[PDB]
Amino acid sequence: SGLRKMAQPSGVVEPCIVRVAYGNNVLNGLWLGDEVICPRHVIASDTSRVINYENELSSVRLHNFSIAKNNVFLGVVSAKYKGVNLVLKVNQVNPNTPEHKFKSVRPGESFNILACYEGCPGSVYGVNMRSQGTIKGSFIAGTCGSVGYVLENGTLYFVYMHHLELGNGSHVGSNLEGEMYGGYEDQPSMQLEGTNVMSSDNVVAFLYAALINGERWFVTNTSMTLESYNSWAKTNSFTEIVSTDAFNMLAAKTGYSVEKLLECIVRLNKGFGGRTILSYGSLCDEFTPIEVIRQMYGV
Amino acid sequence: SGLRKMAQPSGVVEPCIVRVAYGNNVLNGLWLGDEVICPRHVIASDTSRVINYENELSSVRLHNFSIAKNNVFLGVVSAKYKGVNLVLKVNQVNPNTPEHKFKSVRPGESFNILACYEGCPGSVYGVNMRSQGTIKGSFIAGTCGSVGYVLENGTLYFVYMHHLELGNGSHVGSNLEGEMYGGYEDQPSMQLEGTNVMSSDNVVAFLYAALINGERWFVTNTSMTLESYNSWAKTNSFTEIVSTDAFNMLAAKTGYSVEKLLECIVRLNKGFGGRTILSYGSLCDEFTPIEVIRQMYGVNLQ
Ligand SMILES: *[C@@H](O)[C@H](C[C@@H]1CCNC1=O)NC(=O)[C@H](CC(C)C)NC(=O)OCc1ccccc1
Ligand SMILES: *[C@@H](O)[C@H](C[C@@H]1CCNC1=O)NC(=O)[C@H](CC(C)C)NC(=O)OCc1ccccc1
């Protein structure tokens, strides 16, 4: 038993990380085949300043890139943008390129961050995409280019690359197509996040986790229809529930329908009365249904 | 800029995990060289009752082990107990054996758990050893043999192997010499966890982390001596502070002495009661000062 926020093992990703420096900027790249992908602000001459990305590209000196994986030195052959990323062709194919694909994560979905410090993998932890396209992680100077990934059905997907932090502390990256999650710009000027909407799917998963862990104090055989829950959700900053299917296994094992747990949400959102659930003091939307299934049942 | 409980990368460990099956039991082994280490209850006929490990080992037949990882089949050459672990010699050397050492972790120290499910590494997460030898993780059937490790100054240390779960949900394992942390037995009979003692050093580190993150509702310009704080800590289940040297740089960057945070600890222990710190609802002792420094400043990564 027990519930902890987890990362999928990082081993297949770690050999793809390279250090990328240009000028005084130093961040991380993803080396696959003969291509390195990194955040394009590595070529900005002053990141404290609105960047004319287009003059920075047209005046780039390819030899002023410094790219290395331990004592493998990579030279840049060509450089272009793909959205908010630089796509650099390099002079050597990564011999440890794993089979992989690209996709985007959606709000509510969890994924893994390999946090890299100026080219060196340092830590790995799980996160969850919020409704405004941000994650709450732990990033500082030198960590841009840190990559997010997921392992599904035996295949590796790259889903995230880190670019910046908002004034409220939220963290903002792109997919590997160069599209910034949430639509934010890769510029130093002020950028605000809209209201956060809690993932109802994830909070249901959380309460199922609590029931599986033997913690049932909050639950009741009273239930609420999807429709009533969804009318309440819209006026309480919770997502609407589109279908119960993702919960079929949790409901089968526990014997609790989704609809009884929807009644729990509406009630518990008014407060826990100084009790806890899985040691949290308020509803937690950080665990997806599959995250719970993996941890509680091992599949 | 955020604080999250983190693990160091797992790549050097993943290739060392194998499935170990005997009878109806399935768990994980640590394959290094031509040696597999795994919890000895893999061989037990019935883990729901107390076990005579010495007698069961005498009836074991080495061809009844199945040890495997993907396209690797390992046959067992010999077996013996070292503490609560089986040490098996197998017929092939692990070609991806990392350089490594064994050591023990102590209370308040952090390390990494690679959770492994019937031979498949499934997840990695950081933990912190509690005063009674336990960790608060997530472990289920099939995850015994899961390994704990720490990377310090370029050296991979193996520090933990998983064995069991106490009645209160606390998780218990051994070091890699087969000594169980906290002295619990590898038996199904109920054993109690003593009282938990919070690590004061880690709580101070957590409060420093909050301050760096711009969260300071809880702090004042009032302090408490070490001797006063240690007197309190003895009677409120907190460790005593031996010295403030580990916090010099943290103290220099925030402007707050350890002694100010000590007063915060005594005050905040009665309750946050409605506010939060770095989204936590009560004092948290799961981060060491070095863990904090890594995340705030990105240096001492081992
Ligand atoms: C990596 O290049 C860096 C990651 C930031 C640094 C602090 N926490 C992060 O996630 N990205 C930036 O510095 C980014 C630069 C481009 C958007 C031009 N700027 C940024 O994030 O400014 C906000 C900020 C900077 C430094 C500390 C706290 C917030
Ligand atoms: C690994 O084989 C397994 C891991 C336990 C099982 C549940 N959570 C864990 O950490 N270890 C055992 O099953 C162990 C058997 C030996 C000590 C003989 N028994 C155990 O931990 O009993 C307590 C328990 C069993 C099942 C569910 C919850 C607690």
Author numbering:
A (entry chain B): 1 to 299
B (entry chain A): 1 to 302
Give the article text.
Coronaviruses take over the host's transcriptional machinery by encoding two overlapping polyproteins, pp1a and pp1ab, which are cleaved by coronavirus-encoded proteases—papain-like protease (PLpro) and main protease (Mpro, also called 3CLpro) —forming 16 nonstructural proteins (nsps) that are essential for viral replication. Mpro, a cysteine protease, cleaves the polyproteins at 11 conserved sites containing the Leu-Gln↓(Ser, Ala, Gly) sequence, releasing the nsps required for the viral replicase complex. Since Mpro cleavage is required for subsequent viral replication and transcription, Mpro is an attractive target for drug development against coronaviruses. GC376, a dipeptidyl aldehyde bisulfite adduct, is a prodrug that converts into the active-form aldehyde, GC373, upon administration, effectively binding the active site of Mpro and stopping viral replication.
Here, we present crystal structures of FIPV Mpro-GC373/GC376 complexes, revealing the inhibitors covalently bound to Cys144 in the active site, similar to SARS-CoV-2 Mpro. GC376 being the dipeptidyl aldehyde bisulfite adduct form of the drug converts into the active-form aldehyde GC373, thus making both structures identical. In both structures, FIPV Mpro crystallized as a dimer, with each protomer being comprised of three domains, similar to other viral Mpro. The active site of FIPV Mpro contains a Cys144–His41 catalytic dyad located in a cleft between domain I and domain II. In both structures, a covalent bond between Cys144 and the aldehyde of the feline drug reveals that the bisulfite leaving group indeed was removed upon binding. Weak H-bonding was observed between the oxyanion of the inhibitor and His41, the general base in the catalytic dyad, which is distinct from SARS-CoV-2. For the P1 position of the inhibitor, the Nγ of the lactam ring sits in the S1 pocket and forms a H-bond with the carbonyl oxygen of Phe139, a conserved feature in other Mpro structures with GC373. The S2 pocket that supports hydrophobic interactions of a Leu moiety is formed with His41, Ile51, and Leu164. In FIPV Mpro, Ser1 of the N-terminal finger from protomer B forms a weak H-bond (3.8 Å) with the cyclic glutamine analog nitrogen of GC373 in the active site of protomer A, however, this is not seen in SARS-CoV-2 Mpro. While structures of SARS-CoV-2 Mpro co-crystallized with GC376 solved by other groups have shown the drug binding in both R and S hemithioacetal isomer conformations, here we only see the R conformation of the drug bound to FIPV Mpro.
